[model samples]
Target: HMSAEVIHQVEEALSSSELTELKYLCLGRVGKRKLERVQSGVRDLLDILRERGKLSVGDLAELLYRVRRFDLLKRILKMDRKAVETHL
Candidate 1:
């Protein structure tokens, strides 16, 4: 619940190219057709992933880091690789 706004922030923060990167990064899980829609943007994709239980905070942090969106990982989610690893 607390992180719902985090998804909103990410939706607003990511650029078109970053969003494309994210889409392709999760291509297998999200599927190509779902990500290709105009209205299905970042937030919606996150929502789909969330509802499907495919996304966890650590997963998102890792995904963002892979996409090289370090700023969003730190600022929006306040998580990093070390932090996620520590939780394990």
Candidate 2:
């Protein structure tokens, strides 16, 4: 619960191009055909974060990178320079 806002903050760092890749990866190769599937995919990620309940800044950054969203990672680091090496 404490880190839910952090998740949204981190997610917002992602840009349009990065989001395209995110949807593709989150949907597991399911290209943009049905909007619902993409919505479900995003929800899937959020669900995991919600259940986590003890999320970390680094964890979110790692997840974004796992989904190949370096743009978001950079944005996060920019928001908090120390966050690059420390959890917050």
Candidate 3:
């Protein structure tokens, strides 16, 4: 489990319509699991960080915050920071 707590927190916050919108914006970066099991697994998160760049990850962090998932957002930012440290 990469981060079930963060995943479930996001799942609970976002609605289906929002997820559909998200799918489009995150088409290339989408996860393997269906909407029901959607999560920011290592691959997806890494793609966001490595391929998409900070703006994209920032966009996602904002979304999580909009949904009142600040806890998950914080975790993701922390992950982003860790990623940057290792990536550098």
Candidate 4:
């Protein structure tokens, strides 16, 4: 169940620095150059990641964790590291 609202909200929530940080994390699951090319906005990158099966809700949670977006991980995703670990 992909939540378009969640994606939209998150796209709006992140800043350019945070967006770049999240994109770097995504490299673990996606191609670097192509991933770099795909972002017209963070929302577009989110769609591509989901299309390629590179981003799950849990994957988003994990990336947020690594990027130190704890506020977003909790507020947007309702996720913590332990919660995400179990889902995996």
TM-score of each: 0.56, 0.35, 0.34, 0.59
Off by over 4 Å in 1: 28-42, 79-88
lDDT of 2 at 82: 37
In terms of lDDT, the poorest run of 10 residues in model 3 is 41-50
Name the best candidate (by TM-score).
Answer: 4
Candidate 3 lDDT by residue in tens digits, 4-65 = 45444454545444454455544554333233434343324433432444224455554444
Model 2 agreement with the true structure over 5-81: per-residue lDDT tens digits: 55555445544444455445444543232222222235345546446532344444544546534445565444333
lDDT for position 28 in model 3: 52
What lDDT score is found at residue 84 in candidate 1? Answer: 48
> Which regions of candidate 4 fall more than 4 Å away from where they truly are?
28-42, 79-88
Please list the residue runs of candidate 2 whose C-alpha ends up more than 4 Å from where it truly belongs after superposition. Answer: 1-5, 13-55, 79-88
> Listing every candidate in turn, what is its Cα RMSD in Å to the true structure after a full C-alpha superposition?
5.6, 7.4, 9.3, 5.7
What's the lDDT for all of these models? 0.57, 0.45, 0.44, 0.59
Q: Which lDDT tens digits does candidate 4 get at residues 41-67?
A: 455767777667656776776666565
| lDDT order of candidates, top first | 4, 1, 2, 3
1-88 in candidate 1: lDDT tens per residue?
3377766666666654555455566655432222332322445766777565545565666566555455576776567846644644
